[PDB]
Amino acid sequence: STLLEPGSNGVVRLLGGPGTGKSSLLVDTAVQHILDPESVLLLTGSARLRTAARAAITARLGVVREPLVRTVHSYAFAVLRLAAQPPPRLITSAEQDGIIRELLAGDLEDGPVGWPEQLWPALTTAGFATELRDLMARCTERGVDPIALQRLGRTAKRPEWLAAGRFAQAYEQIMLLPALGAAELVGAALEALGADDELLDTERNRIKLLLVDDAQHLDPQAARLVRALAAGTGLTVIAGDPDQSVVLLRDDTHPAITLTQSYRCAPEIASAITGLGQRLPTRHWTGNPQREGTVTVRLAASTHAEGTMIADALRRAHLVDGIPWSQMAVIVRSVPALARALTAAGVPVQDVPVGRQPAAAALLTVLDVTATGHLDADSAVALLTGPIGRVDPVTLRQLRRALRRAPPRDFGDLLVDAIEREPKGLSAEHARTLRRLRAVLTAARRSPRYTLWQAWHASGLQRRWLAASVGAQADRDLDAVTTLFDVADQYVNRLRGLVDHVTRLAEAVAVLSVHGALAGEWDFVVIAGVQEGLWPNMIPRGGVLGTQHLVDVLDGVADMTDRTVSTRAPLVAEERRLLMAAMGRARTRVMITAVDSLLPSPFCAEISAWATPPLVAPRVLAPSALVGRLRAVVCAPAVDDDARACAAAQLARLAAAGVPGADPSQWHAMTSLTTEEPLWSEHVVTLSPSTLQMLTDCPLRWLLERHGGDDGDVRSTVGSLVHALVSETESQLVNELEKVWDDLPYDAKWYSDNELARHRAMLETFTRWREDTRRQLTEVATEIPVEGIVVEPPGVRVRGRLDRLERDLVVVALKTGKSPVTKDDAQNHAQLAMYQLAVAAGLGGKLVYLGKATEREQDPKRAEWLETVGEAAAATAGPRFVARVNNGCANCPVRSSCPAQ
Ligand SMILES: Nc1ncnc2c1ncn2[C@@H]1O[C@H](COP(=O)(O)OP(=O)(O)NP(=O)(O)O)[C@@H](O)[C@H]1O
Ligand code: SF4
Numbered sequence: 001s002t003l004l005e006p007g008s009n010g011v012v013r014l015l016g017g018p019g020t021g022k023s024s025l026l027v028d029t030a031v032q033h034i035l036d037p038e039s040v041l042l043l044t045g046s047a048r049l050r051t052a053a054r055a056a057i058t059a060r061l062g063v064v065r066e067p068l069v070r071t072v073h074s075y076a077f078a079v080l081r082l083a084a085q086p087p088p089r090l091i092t093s094a095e096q097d098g099i100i101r102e103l104l105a106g107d108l109e110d111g112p113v114g115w116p117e118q119l120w121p122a123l124t125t126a127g128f129a130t131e132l133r134d135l136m137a138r139c140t141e142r143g144v145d146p147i148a149l150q151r152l153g154r155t156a157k158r159p160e161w162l163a164a165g166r167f168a169q170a171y172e173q174i175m176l177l178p179a180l181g182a183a184e185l186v187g188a189a190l191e192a193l194g195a196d197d198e199l200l201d202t203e204r205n206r207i208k209l210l211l212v213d214d215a216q217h218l219d220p221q222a223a224r225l226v227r228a229l230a231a232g233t234g235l236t237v238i239a240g241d242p243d244q245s246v247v248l249l250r251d252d253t254h255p256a257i258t259l260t261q262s263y264r265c266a267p268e269i270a271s272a273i274t275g276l277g278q279r280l281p282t283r284h285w286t287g288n289p290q291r292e293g294t295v296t297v298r299l300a301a302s303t304h305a306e307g308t309m310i311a312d313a314l315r316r317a318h319l320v321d322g323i324p325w326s327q328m329a330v331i332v333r334s335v336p337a338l339a340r341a342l343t344a345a346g347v348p349v350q351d352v353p354v355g356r357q358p359a360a361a362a363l364l365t366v367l368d369v370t371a372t373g374h375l376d377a378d379s380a381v382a383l384l385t386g387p388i389g390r391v392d393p394v395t396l397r398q399l400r401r402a403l404r405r406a407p408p409r410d411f412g413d414l415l416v417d418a419i420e421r422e423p424k425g426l427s428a429e430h431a432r433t434l435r436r437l438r439a440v441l442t443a444a445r446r447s448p449r450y451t452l453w454q455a456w457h458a459s460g461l462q463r464r465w466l467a468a469s470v471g472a473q474a475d476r477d478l479d480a481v482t483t484l485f486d487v488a489d490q491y492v493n494r495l496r497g498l499v500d501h502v503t504r505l506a507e508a509v510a511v512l513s514v515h516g517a518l519a520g521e522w523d524f525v526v527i528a529g530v531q532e533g534l535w536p537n538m539i540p541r542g543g544v545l546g547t548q549h550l551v552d553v554l555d556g557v558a559d560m561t562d563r564t565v566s567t568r569a570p571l572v573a574e575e576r577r578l579l580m581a582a583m584g585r586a587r588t589r590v591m592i593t594a595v596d597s598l599l600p601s602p603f604c605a606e607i608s609a610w611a612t613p614p615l616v617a618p619r620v621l622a623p624s625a626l627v628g629r630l631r632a633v634v635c636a637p638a639v640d641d642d643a644r645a646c647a648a649a650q651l652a653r654l655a656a657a658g659v660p661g662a663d664p665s666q667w668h669a670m671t672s673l674t675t676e677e678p679l680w681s682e683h684v685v686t687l688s689p690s691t692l693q694m695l696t697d698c699p700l701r702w703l704l705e706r707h708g709g710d711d712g713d714v715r716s717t718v719g720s721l722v723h724a725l726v727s728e729t730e731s732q733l734v735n736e737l738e739k740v741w742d743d744l745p746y747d748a749k750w751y752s753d754n755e756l757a758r759h760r761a762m763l764e765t766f767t768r769w770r771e772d773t774r775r776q777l778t779e780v781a782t783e784i785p786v787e788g789i790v791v792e793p794p795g796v797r798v799r800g801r802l803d804r805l806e807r808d809l810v811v812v813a814l815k816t817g818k819s820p821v822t823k824d825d826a827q828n829h830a831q832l833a834m835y836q837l838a839v840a841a842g843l844g845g846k847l848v849y850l851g852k853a854t855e856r857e858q859d860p861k862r863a864e865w866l867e868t869v870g871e872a873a874a875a876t877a878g879p880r881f882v883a884r885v886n887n888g889c890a891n892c893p894v895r896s897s898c899p900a901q
Pocket of ligand 1: 019021024518
């Protein structure tokens with residue numbers, strides 16, 4: 001307190017625990033030294049914390065000037081910006097590792113670097129250049145010149161470090177023949193402070209406070225600017241906590257100021273944090289005595305039961321205890337499953353490429369129409385099913401039946417000719433969704449960053465997405481089209497190149513990882529997923545170049561020149577700091593969750609000493625979770641004679657205000673049939689001989705598969721293309737099947753010409769059948785429509801398409817199956833005996849199998865048969881259809897709604 005005064009000098013160090021008044025004491029000394037705007041320099045260490053401390057000072061200060069609030073990287077650029085009295089910075093690592101892919105492919109083509117010849121197949125891989133980039137990016141943070149990395153390649157017998165140092169030296173000579181990376185920005189500025197030797201004295205004479213902040217995360221190359229700027233003038237405060245590694249604080253000759261009172265954390269949270277610091281290689285601080293807090297550890301028995309009790313405890317707190325959303329958080333060790341099972345209880349919770357999302361990709365299809373000049377068929381259907389002018393799949397089927405009234409032509413060709421000029425056919429409501437697509441393609445074709453805005457103006461849906469903000473998808477799409485207008489501007493400053501480049505490119509529960517959870521406050525913190533393979537991280541840190549072994553020989557004597565512990569797993573004592581500092585955010589209470597069928601980590605057995613069987617079916621406060629259970633203890637045979645009264649007493653309070661599922665009108669077991677009528681009632685039923693086999697077999701399959709339920713093929717229309725050719729010279733028919741075959745929906749075009757071969761020969765099999773049996777038979781006609789009245793008084797009235805007559809009359813029915821029906825199974829064949837009974841009365845049978853020509857016969861039992869047609873056709877009358885189990889109870893369409901299974 002006596003060391004922070006306007007009359008004072010030197011370096012003061014300010015260290016304290018997690019939560020204490022550190023960063024709000026640098027703001028308290030920024031203002032107290034002003035009451036000069038300049039020399040009040042901060043180094044906040046984040047781009048978002050720079051504005052958090054700027055607005056804190058400038059509100060506490062009649063207009064004012066600005067204290068200089070910056071970061072370390074943004075300050076080392078301003079030194080380089082002034083030392084050129086412009087120093088440019090290179091792009092993000094796409095353009096910086098696009099240089100790495102060139103120098104490796106430019107080395108494998110040759111035979112100077114000298115890779116150790118085992119790594120020769122590795123050099124073309126994308127996974128080698130994203131590891132070579134890290135051996136340079138982790139020496140750049142530690143100030144190691146490539147002429148000094150090669151000294152390590154000789155003292156130890158490691159050939160791939162001499163090869164890596166010669167890469168990092170040859171890399172820095174084509175980047176200067178400047179161009180600075182991201183991490184190379186502090187190290188390049190520090191060479192320019194000691195170069196001029198008057199640039200120092202014209203910098204130190206400016207600054208007066210140097211309120212550097214968050215000193216613990218500072219690199220040993222960024223820890224030397226703070227030692228250079230604070231060489232001599234005024235007074236400097238360092239601050240931060242020294243025992244959270246994850247200027248220097250631990251070793252200094254400068255006087256320190258400790259802080260032990262927390263101001264945030266409860267005293268029961270402050271004993272679990274400092275209780276874990278006992279088995280850890282200023283660890284004593286106390287909690288806020290005004291608060292009272294709870295720490296508890298819960299276990300689950302599965303993965304889905306974890307997300308069901310997290311969404312329990314997040315729902316108990318807001319809805320009963322009253323703490324709002326956005327004072328809650330869910331911290332996970334690392335993000336790839338939990339946000340889906342936590343939204344399903346009704347909790348507000350706050351990747352995919354840019355040109356792939358449907359609100360953005362529907363507008364890039366307007367540009368491909370515009371760039372070519374004519375719109376195709378496959379990209380004119382893709383505008384109707386998209387967001388611009390939208391149609392559900394049953395209104396494509398209403399366009400086609402209205403456009404084809406203007407063989408039928410294909411829908412891909414009729415659509416384009418309705419956008420080019422609008423026909424006056426439909427005009428009801430489909431005229432509007434076609435005028436919307438003429439308004440876009442006339443605006444963009446009459447006009448590259450000025451056309452793409454003019455398309456967004458014509459397809460007027462910035463108005464429709466603001467009024468409807470289903471209200472989340474408008475805020476997901478508007479937060480995605482504004483990433484086109486940002487990326488499309490970035491290519492214009494440097495329209496077939498627009499499409500070519502983009503193609504390659506509140507009050508909620510914050511779910512975030514541990515490294516993102518070092519800025520929030522959050523009254524309630526859940527640490528989900530502390531278990532065996534996940535939190536004590538046993539993914540081994542080995543690699544090819546030995547990056548994790550270089551980084552702990554070069555940065556300290558953590559390992560000697562022995563590769564024994566170089567590639568094991570993340571260190572456990574340095575992994576305990578993450579769970580010790582994630583609990584350091586909650587100011588009221590902490591819940592720690594892990595599943596155990598997936599085995600809990602040993603950190604869950606250590607918290608249970610300081611906390612205040614696993615669940616397998618947990619309780620929820622979801623409204624669809626109440627009314628499910630309340631209906632299950634009232635519709636019960638066999639417990640709870642007293643609780644049954646309490647069950648139905650609470651459903652009457654749910655049903656009076658809404659809550660769907662509550663009232664006994666809403667229950668799916670309580671609904672009643674619509675009609676239960678006697679069908680036709682009143683009459684002559686009508687039948688065809690191809691349903692009579694089916695009707696007798698099972699009369700429920702007649703009702704559901706003939707009327708509605710029929711799931712759609714390519715094998716049944718070829719079977720009718722054979723019947724058309726056969727009914728019309730055996731070489732004049734092969735030429736007829738050959739032309740028409742090329743338009744059939746066959747994938748695998750090796751199979752279309754392989755299925756033609758068995759259907760070409762099946763016409764030669766038929767003419768090889770005719771000449772054999774034209775001595776015993778004689779054709780009367782072919783494809784006679786049979787119609788008449790049979791079993792007249794109900795009458796059954798057989799109608800339809802006898803295939804081929806012959807005469808010794810007889811009845812020939814041609815089939816194209818491969819496997820024939822047996823000999824004694826065709827004596828009761830219901831199709832032939834309906835034609836045979838047609839031949840007799842008013843106005844033997846053959847069953848020729850073209851394919852694999854084994855024919856079957858039926859002998860010329862009429863009273864036993866004619867009573868069966870009248871007995872079966874009477875069962876197509878009433879309700880309550882019978883579901884017999886037949887041979888066809890497999891590859892039948894209606895089976896998921898059968899009551900016999
Ligand atoms: N004198 C005070 N009176 C009331 N509240 C205070 C006082 N001093 C600090 N606080 C509050 O205590 C909390 C501690 O925040 P602060 O001390 O600024 O964080 P920090 O410890 O510097 N940063 P970090 O450890 O990374 O979370 C904040 O909500 C402050 O507003
Ligand atoms: S599964 Fe059996 S009862 Fe059901 S429709 Fe098919 S044949 Fe008829």
